[PDB]
Amino acid sequence: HPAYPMPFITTILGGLYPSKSILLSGTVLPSAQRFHINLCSGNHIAFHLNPRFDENAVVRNTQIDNSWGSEERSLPRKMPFVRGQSFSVWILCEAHCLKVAVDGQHLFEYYHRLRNLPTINRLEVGGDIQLTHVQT
Numbered sequence: 001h002p003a004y005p006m007p008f009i010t011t012i013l014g015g016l017y018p019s020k021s022i023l024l025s026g027t028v029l030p031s032a033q034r035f036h037i038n039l040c041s042g043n044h045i046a047f048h049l050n051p052r053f054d055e056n057a058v059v060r061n062t063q064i065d066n067s068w069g070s071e072e073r074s075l076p077r078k079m080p081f082v083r084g085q086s087f088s089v090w091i092l093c094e095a096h097c098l099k100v101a102v103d104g105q106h107l108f109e110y111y112h113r114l115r116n117l118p119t120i121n122r123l124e125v126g127g128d129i130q131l132t133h134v135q136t
């Protein structure tokens with residue numbers, strides 16, 4: 001299995017809705033600094049999942065136009081993403097929030113800030129990883 005182009009952008013026909021799942025698998029580059037997964041709506045980023053190896057954190061936020069909201073960084077356990085290590089991310093959309101699991105284990109919830117779920121119809125992946133698979 002080769003690699004997807006990076007950054008990778010693709011439409012999510014129908015957008016989001018309760019029970020909607022988006023899966024991604026890949027490998028964090030050996031000296032990765034950061035990478036991100038965005039769920040977009042028009043010119044806004046409804047959900048920005050941003051693991052950072054330089055800060056050893058997983059940042060989540062929303063951007064309306066060019067205005068970033070308040071970041072959410074809480075984690076129930078140690079940073080699950082590791083440089084040079086393969087990973088899988090599962091994003092499950094519920095009515096009130098997104099539930100995110102990494103490597104098969106739930107990591108956090110993100111309450112919807114952009115609530116018109118069907119309008120969240122674009123996925124963007126960028127940064128320091130080798131993207132090997134996406135299931136929209």
Ligand SMILES: CC(=O)N[C@H]1[C@H]([C@H](O)[C@H](O)CO)O[C@@](O[C@H]2[C@@H](O)[C@@H](CO)O[C@@H](O[C@H]3[C@H](O)[C@@H](O)[C@H](O)O[C@@H]3CO)[C@@H]2O)(C(=O)O)C[C@@H]1O
Pocket residue numbers: 036048050059060061068071
């Ligand atoms: C190429 C480029 O310049 N685009 C960047 C953008 C912006 O342009 C940025 O001004 C320059 O990097 O930032 C990107 O990352 C930002 C994003 O992860 C947000 C999410 O909250 O955080 C920004 O950093 C915050 C930092 O976390 C805070 O502690 C600090 O108080 O404020 C910073 C600035 O708001 C990231 O820069 C982006 O995805 O928009 C990366 C792009 O490459």
Ligand code: NI
Pocket residue numbers: 133134135
């Ligand atoms: Ni496939």
